[PDB]
Design a protein around this ligand. Structure first.
Ligand code: ATR
Ligand code: 1CY
Length: 159
């Protein structure tokens, strides 16, 4: 079970300036809920952008993809090929752009959060992985977060 999880604006933007371009505590809780107790897979650059205080993300098997054999990722494990990361009974790829792309052909599930905000793509923006017509699933109802930011959840799957 290889899966991809991400949160995007409507336009497909999932990150800008090194930041998630919105505040959505319901997304963080959603993310935790899907991935808790399973393996998470991230690129080295993504681990590098998490505060030392927060990494590894707790209650989950943290795997970090890197070419550097000497890479220090305390509390996590480091693998040097996509094949080796995607082993466990249930894996969620959590970022970033290179790892999303890399892992796409192996994915049979996506969990997405679409956030109702109009952010036309700009050069440099991190972008959601592109879903083709092989996918099927549920595009859920719009929902107001506590702050009044609107978001909805996709739950898609394939062979
Ligand atoms: N095919 C591959 N094999 C091994 N490591 C890879 C890989 N593709 C990407 N990576 C790692 O994953 C990193 C990318 O992580 P990321 O997906 O979080 O980056 P970004 O935020 O730019 O999309 C790459 O820099 C590379 O790490 P190192 O720079 O430490 O080598
Ligand atoms: C919190 C957030 C944005 N939310 C969802 N739905 N999916 C992810 N992969 N996330 C995410 C989690 C950890 C990291 Cl390092 C990056 C993005």
């Amino acid at each position: 079970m290889v899966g991809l999880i991400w949160a995007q604006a409507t336009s497909g933007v999932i990150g800008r300036g090194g930041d998630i371009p919105w505040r959505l505590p319901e997304d963080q809780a959603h993310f935790r809920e899907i991935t808790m107790g399973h393996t998470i897979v991230m690129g080295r650059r993504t681990w590098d952008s998490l505060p030392a205080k927060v990494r590894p993300l707790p209650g989950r098997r943290n795997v970090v993809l890197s070419r550097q054999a000497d890479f220090m990722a305390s509390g996590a494990e480091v693998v040097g090929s996509l094949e080796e990361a995607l082993t466990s009974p249930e894996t969620w790829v959590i970022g970033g752009g290179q790892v999303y792309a890399l892992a796409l052909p192996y994915a049979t599930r996506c969990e997405v959060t679409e956030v109702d905000i109009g952010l036309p793509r700009e050069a440099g923006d991190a972008l959601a992985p592109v879903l083709d017509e092989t996918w099927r699933g549920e595009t859920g109802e719009w929902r107001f977060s506590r702050s009044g930011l609107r978001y909805r959840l996709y739950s898609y799957h394939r062979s």
